Amino acid sequence: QVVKPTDERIIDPSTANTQLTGGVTYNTTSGGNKPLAGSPYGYETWIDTGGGVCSLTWYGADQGGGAAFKCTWTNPHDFLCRLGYFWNENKPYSHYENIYCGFNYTRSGRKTAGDYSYIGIYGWSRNPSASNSNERLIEYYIVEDWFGNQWQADTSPMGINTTGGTVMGSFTVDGSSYQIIKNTRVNQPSIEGDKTFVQYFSIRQSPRKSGTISITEHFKKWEKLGMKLGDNMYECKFLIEAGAGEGFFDARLIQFYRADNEGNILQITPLEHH
């Protein structure tokens, strides 16, 4: 079985309501993962050159769980901003054991991020031994929240109308049902260039702005549904994606941590200084 950890370094997301200040700003496409100074985490941004202005401020290694950030966008064409674990070292998700993310943020309201948008956990994984050639590369999302659009409230879950693909199943974890979606992508931009790959989504049925995500539980459910991740996880990061519009995201807390099956902490931020 899996026991959840109990460690005083884990910040209660329900009470992490304090606006953060300071940190380091970036405002152009990063060119993939870039390591953050004095941090186990990397960030990645895509800020398209169409005329839109976007910005990221990382709150630094000492506060807000160590992976907290804000960002803003003005008329982007698909703004992506993510921060967290970068791995890409030929290890499956299960190598990293039980992965959790405690979070708390505020954000702009409904219709401030275009027709599609995503908030939550994101990454890629490679499955070289996949029987289906389409399924050798995987992009993944655990969607906690979004900005809705003119047809749908941000307080209601997005569906296949937005994500594309096919509903695969459901499970309940961290206080909500999640709908599972798989979408095969043909000739689209990926971390391996324009090609065919598969997307996996868990869409939280009750969207929220704070709590804890039991990331490994999603990985396990996907694999139980035959949605394989393979032996090479690329990254596991907290993402905001805005299709268009003009908005903000501002985290009081993004705290990644990992624990073994009995609940012993393997990695947590911040690290203590002396």
Q: Where are the domains of the chain?
A: 1-274
Q: Rounded to whole angstroms, how far apart are CA atoms 209 and 226?
A: 30
Phi, psi of 196 (to 5 degrees): -95, 130
A 10 A CB-CB count for 97 gives 15
Structure tokens, 5: 């950890």
Residue type, 213: I
Amino acid at 69: F
15 secondary structure, DSSP code: G
Method of determination?
X-ray
Distance CA 120, CA 209 (A): 10
The residues near 274 (Cβ < 8 Å, ≥ 6 apart) are: none
Q: Are strands 79-86 and 42-46 parallel, antiparallel or unpaired?
A: antiparallel
137-145 and 193-204 strand pairing: parallel
CB 91 within 8 A of CB 235: no
Pairing state between β 246-259 and 265-268: antiparallel
Contact 203, 181 (CB under 8 A): yes
> If DSSP codes are grouped into helix, strand and coil, which group holds residue 61?
coil
Stated in angstroms to one decimal place, the resolution of this structure is 1.9
| Residue type at position 27 | N
Q: Summarize the chain as % helix, strand, coil (round to 5).
A: 10, 45, 45
Within 13 Å and on the Cβ side, how many CA atoms surround 133? 3
CA atoms within 13 A on the CB side of 28: 1
Active site residues: 139, 241
